[PDB]
């Protein structure tokens, strides 16, 4: 029951925090305002625009009122402001985390493809509704503490509803799981799906160059009837048997000629089969496992051309690839019958093993658009590091604080500083979204520099 003195907020920390707050404020105001002007002048545009609105709203609602409450240590306004400021704050936070998830999913759907403004209204409606409990639980109370008479605006311990009484006690867990863990989980999930989708896209362009793509049944360089991307339909010399097997292969024959999308589906079947056969092979699985995503596709390319058995014959080269001896395996593969028979395909594949990149196949325009989206996902990394100090502070208050442990005043003193730091970090994220997007997108960088 005794105490140490939790007025805390050393007069020295008040200067540092309020200077950091002013820097983040104007830079966040300027940064998000000029971002909105670029969007309103020139799909992903509106999602970034909604994010900047949530950023701008979060800056103006969460920075000044906490700067005042730090220096003045008082709530001068009425009960409406006590119920309005937290309500607007949790609405802007919801808009921000939902815009990021809608933005990440948008990048996944943009790559997997081979009702946007509706989500905005859905985001803002859901963000407001989920923030409503803040406008009901907050209220103004007074007390005679120490030698003064204070007027406090807080989340009331007593509520007129069993649901609100639960929200008053478990608010920080609801914020930590929904406004932090859930976006991190959703984003990391669709980022993983996007990279796996970009990988099966590159292996398509890779094989399309080395094997070609034909929408009608054709005869191969060896002389066998083939369609799609090197999809063997039959090894029989009868052209009539090829048409019969082709119609039996698809299940819905358009007389023997297909489109681009049908061949892509056929191609993905063969890649899945090639991956399964490699994993079932005791010679190929250990080498395939040690390889990166790029060199995995180079091995799948060889399995596409020579089958699992033929690739397994490169005993010396496979061991070199497993031991990451790229140049030694390149020289060894060049001495093969495979290199002599198909030099163009072999030289590109060998180069891919040698350099570990897609440089021999993909064009630079596609290479640039991919690296933008993949790196632009760093907005969630900044989101995770900026909102962690504030969330960690509220978690520690629900974990370490015990009324019966008398040295707790030293703890509340520490939490006051961590709370005002976390409120600056969470606002710096709204301030860093234009800075990070400017430094990353390159296109946005030239649009930013066009101002001044």
């Amino acid at each position: 029951p005794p105490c140490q003195g939790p007025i805390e907020i050393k007069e020295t920390f008040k200067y540092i925090n309020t200077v950091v707050s002013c820097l983040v404020f104007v830079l966040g105001i300027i940064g998000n305002s000029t971002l909105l002007y670029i969007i309103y002048k020139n799909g992903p545009n509106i999602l970034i625009a909604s994010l900047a609105l949530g950023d701008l709203l979060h800056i103006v609602i969460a920075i000044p009122i906490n700067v005042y409450k730090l220096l003045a240590e008082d709530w001068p306004f009425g009960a409406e402001m006590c119920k309005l400021v937290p309500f607007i704050q949790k609405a802007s936070v919801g808009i921000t985390v939902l815009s990021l998830c809608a933005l990440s999913i948008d990048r996944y759907r943009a790559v997997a493809s081979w009702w946007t403004a509706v989500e905005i209204v859905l985001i803002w409606v859901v963000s407001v509704v989920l923030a409503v409990p803040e406008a009901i639980g907050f209220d103004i109370i007074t007390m005679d503490y120490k030698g003064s008479y204070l007027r406090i605006c807080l989340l009331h311990p007593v509520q007129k509803t069993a649901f609100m009484q639960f929200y008053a006690t478990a608010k920080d867990w609801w914020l930590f799981s929904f406004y932090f863990c859930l976006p991190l989980a959703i984003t990391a999930f669709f980022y993983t799906l996007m990279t796996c989708e970009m990988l099966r896209k590159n292996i398509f362009e890779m094989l399309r160059i080395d094997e070609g793509l034909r929408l009608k049944i054709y005869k191969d360089t060896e002389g066998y009837y083939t369609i799609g991307i090197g999809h063997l339909l039959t090894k029989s010399p009868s052209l009539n048997a090829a048409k019969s097997e082709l119609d039996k292969a698809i299940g819905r024959n358009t007389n023997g000629v297909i489109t681009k999308d049908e061949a892509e589906k056929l191609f993905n079947q063969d890649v899945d089969a090639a991956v399964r056969g490699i994993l079932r092979n005791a010679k190929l699985k250990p080498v395939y496992d040690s390889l990166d995503a790029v060199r995995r596709a180079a091995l799948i390319n060889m399995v596409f051309q020579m089958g699992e058995t033929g690739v397994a014959g490169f005993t010396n080269s496979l061991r070199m690839l497993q031991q990451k001896r790229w140049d030694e395996a390149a020289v060894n593969l060049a001495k093969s019958r495979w290199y002599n028979q198909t030099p163009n395909r072999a030289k590109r594949v060998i180069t891919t093993f040698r350099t570990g990149t897609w440089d021999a196949y993909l064009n630079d325009h596609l290479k640039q658009r991919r690296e933008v989206a993949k790196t632009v996902f760093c907005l969630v990394l900044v989101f995770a590091l900026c909102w962690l100090p504030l969330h960690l502070a509220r978690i520690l208050k629900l974990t370490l604080y015990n009324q019966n442990d008398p040295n707790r005043c030293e703890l509340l003193s520490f939490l006051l500083v961590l709370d005002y730091i976390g409120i600056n970090m969470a606002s710096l994220n709204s301030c860093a979204n234009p800075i990070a997007l400017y430094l990353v997108s390159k296109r946005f960088k030239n649009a930013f520099k066009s101002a001044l």
Binding site: K69, Y145, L154, P157
Partner: peptide, 21 residues
């Protein structure tokens, strides 16, 4: 912030100085 009860004036003074979150 919030407190277990208004009888904990040390916690209520904490929310007096605490951020509005």
């Amino acid at each position: 912030c919030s407190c277990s009860s208004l009888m904990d004036k040390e916690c209520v003074y904490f929310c007096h100085l605490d951020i509005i979150w």
